[PDB]
């Protein structure tokens, strides 16, 4: 959601030219971050390994208002509220390993070739 | 049949060579074409200059930078003919045009390798004696190619080195013949001759 917004020098940190400073949204997000940090502290989590593992804002029921237009017309003036949810998780390394075996299937000729190689090599 | 076929472009009619090379590239053969400045076109030099000026007249009216790009080097002219002979807007055509490489003169990778000809494209074999023809280098410099003389100088230097190499190779072959003539006409040679070698 950036079309026809102005450019800034502070988008180079992120490779883009269009970046902004949404004060109200940032305040809401950091308030929810504070709440999640409180929940994690109550749960007994690390508070230093914590990273935002999930964040999701989606549209809420619009709040309707009216605007008035030339020649006696009425158009909509809608708020576009958001549901914001987020989950912080303690960081961890790549625990997973030891992938599936994928048992092999050889024919008689393949088995004979493997046996012959095993005999020839020492 | 071969990994790369390198074609001496000298004396070759541009259209016949382009048709041959396009068929080969689509068939999957890597081709490098050297001496593009010595390619021939049938007909008078003035005629092919008029043809290139007709080509030059065509350009996108509202923006000449979107229009046809009239390339001037002889290698680029040969490439344009071949790209016209290839279905270049499909991935197969792009793969063939990637298989093709064309140069003016003979760059260092290819001056040390064998160069072949396409007799069904060679002007001396195809054109009737007494028919006029032009040279791609002469046409290119007439229409704006800037390196007729740099290429000619590098070509003279390369031909000098190659002639020295050929003299050395002749000397080695002749000395091999002189030394192994004593071992020639032997019983093994007679048996090979009877067998057909």
């Amino acid at each position: 959601f950036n079309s026809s917004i102005g450019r800034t020098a502070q988008g180079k940190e992120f490779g883009v030219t269009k970046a902004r400073w949404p004060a109200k949204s940032v305040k809401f997000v950091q308030g929810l971050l504070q709440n999640a940090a409180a929940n994690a502290e109550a749960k007994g989590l690390d508070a230093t390994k914590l990273y935002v593992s999930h964040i999701q804002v989606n549209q809420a029921p619009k709040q309707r208002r009216r605007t008035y237009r030339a020649h006696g017309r009425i158009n909509k003036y809608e708020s576009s509220p958001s549901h914001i949810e987020l989950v912080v998780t303690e960081k961890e390394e790549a625990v997973a390993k030891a992938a599936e075996k994928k048992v092999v299937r050889l024919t008689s000729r393949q088995r004979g070739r493997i046996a012959a190689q095993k005999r020839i090599a020492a | 049949v071969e990994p790369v076929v390198v074609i001496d472009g000298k004396g070759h009619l541009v259209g016949r060579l382009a048709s041959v090379v396009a068929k080969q590239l689509l068939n999957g053969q890597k081709i490098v074409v050297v001496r593009a400045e010595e390619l021939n076109i049938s007909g008078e030099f003035f005629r092919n200059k008029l043809k290139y000026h007709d080509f030059l007249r065509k350009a996108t009216a509202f923006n000449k930078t979107r229009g046809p790009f009239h390339f001037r080097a002889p290698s680029r002219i040969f490439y344009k003919a071949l790209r016209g002979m290839v279905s270049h807007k499909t991935a197969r055509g792009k793969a063939a045009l990637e298989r093709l490489k064309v140069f003016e003169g003979i760059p260092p990778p290819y001056d040390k390798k064998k160069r072949v000809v396409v007799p069904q494209a060679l002007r001396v074999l195809r054109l009737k004696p007494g028919r006029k023809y032009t040279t791609l280098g002469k046409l290119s410099t007439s229409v704006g190619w800037k390196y007729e003389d740099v290429v000619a100088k590098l070509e003279a230097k390369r031909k000098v080195s190659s002639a020295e190499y050929y003299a050395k190779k002749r000397a080695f072959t002749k000395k091999v013949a002189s030394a192994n003539a004593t071992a020639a006409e032997s019983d093994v040679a007679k048996q090979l001759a009877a067998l057909g070698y």
Partner: protein
């Protein structure tokens, strides 16, 4: 010594086609060294393999094969028609196929 090739080299040129429609069920094969239908008549009925490699192992090999056969000649210039148990993947127009010498009749 250094040569173990027991087949003739060939190129997969295209599918059997008209100007504007192709038939993937028949492939056109050029046999290297062969330039006449008279000389290509030797290879009629000979088996052909398109051998390619995948990054995933299937049954102990990373190499897969698609078999086929030379069915008839095509044109006046030594190209032949070939039919494969699976149609050639159409990215192999100009790829190398191996025309084996069997079923042999010499």
């Amino acid at each position: 010594a250094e040569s173990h090739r027991l087949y003739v080299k060939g190129k997969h040129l295209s599918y059997q086609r008209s100007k504007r429609v192709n038939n993937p069920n028949v492939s056109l094969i050029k046999i290297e060294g062969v330039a006449t239908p008279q000389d290509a008549q030797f290879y009629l009925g000979k088996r052909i393999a398109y051998v390619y490699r995948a990054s995933k192992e299937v049954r102990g090999s990373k190499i897969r094969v698609m078999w086929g056969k030379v069915t008839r000649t095509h044109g006046n210039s030594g190209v032949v028609r070939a039919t494969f148990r699976n149609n050639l993947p159409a990215k192999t127009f100009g790829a190398s196929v191996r025309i084996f010498l069997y079923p042999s009749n010499i």
